[PDB]
Amino acid sequence: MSGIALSRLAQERKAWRKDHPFGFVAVPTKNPDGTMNLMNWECAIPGKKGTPWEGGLFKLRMLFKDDYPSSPPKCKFEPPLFHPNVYPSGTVCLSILEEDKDWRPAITIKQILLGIQELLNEPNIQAPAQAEAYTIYCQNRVEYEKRVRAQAKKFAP
């Protein structure tokens, strides 16, 4: 009973294909039978130029629930990334990605991917999702940036 989610996702796919930010990727995965699985998208977010993330292309999976758009999609970096707001599982945390917080129907896939891109170099230090990145960020900013640069080079296309 995901007909409503599928209707919306079909339109978001057409909208994304028509126009999206350069360097970004967002494509529905395929089912075993070759048909599109609109509930599972493979995406990629480019590091923002001028930041320690530049040059890297960070892959992420967007998973939609049957009640979408009442609920936000679950976004997970694959593989998990070193970042204060990224769970060890890879799940990314953002106010617009929480039903109890800022998620709303007015939110698009483009807004979500741009929101995550912005979060990369502008982490929410008050609400960390992992102890590792938070600890380093707070104790040695230079070291933190060093680790970020290495990771960006590691995921350079």
Binding site: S89, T91, P128, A129, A131, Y134, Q139
Partner: protein, 157 residues
């Protein structure tokens, strides 16, 4: 007399002492240290009965040492997972799963104060613990004495 299961089910200073002079060994012996989540549970239940009184302080400290030595000395035990889940259960770090943070952090903080001074404690975990104990939090602000003590101790690690 008492048993480990009843103690963990309904922790109390009296029940801990009722376990006998070998209570420290019993707690570790009866805990599945192959599971980080279970070690966190045992550590919190045991520390929840901490009292700044000779017999109880010794019993809690000895139990913590037996349990954590057994867990940490396991080459396969994931110490990072333990720390993360401990912080989650103490309500200092968010989690994707639903967990009911403990009410009183006094015992846990005092037990940690003792633990971090032991040889079995992986020093690599000190910076992470320090980052989350110094991070603003209502619960910690209520147990200022224990919090300040633990931090002062962490500075010497």
């Amino acid at each position: 007399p008492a048993d480990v299961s009843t103690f963990l089910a309904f922790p109390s200073p009296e029940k801990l002492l009722r376990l006998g002079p070998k209570s420290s060994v019993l707690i570790a012996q009866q805990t599945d240290t192959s599971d980080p989540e279970k070690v966190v549970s045992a550590f919190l239940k045991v520390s929840s009965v901490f009292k700044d009184e000779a017999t109880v302080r010794m019993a809690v400290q000895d139990a913590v040492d037996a349990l954590m030595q057994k867990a940490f000395n396991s080459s396969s035990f994931n110490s990072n997972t333990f720390l993360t889940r401990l912080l989650v259960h103490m309500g200092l770090l968010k989690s994707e799963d639903k967990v009911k943070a403990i009410a009183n952090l006094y015992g846990p903080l005092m037990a940690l104060n003792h633990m971090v001074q032991q040889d079995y404690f992986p020093k690599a975990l000190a910076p992470l613990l320090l980052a989350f104990v110094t991070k603003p939090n209502s619960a910690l602000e209520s147990c200022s004495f224990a919090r300040h003590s633990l931090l002062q101790t962490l500075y010497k690690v």
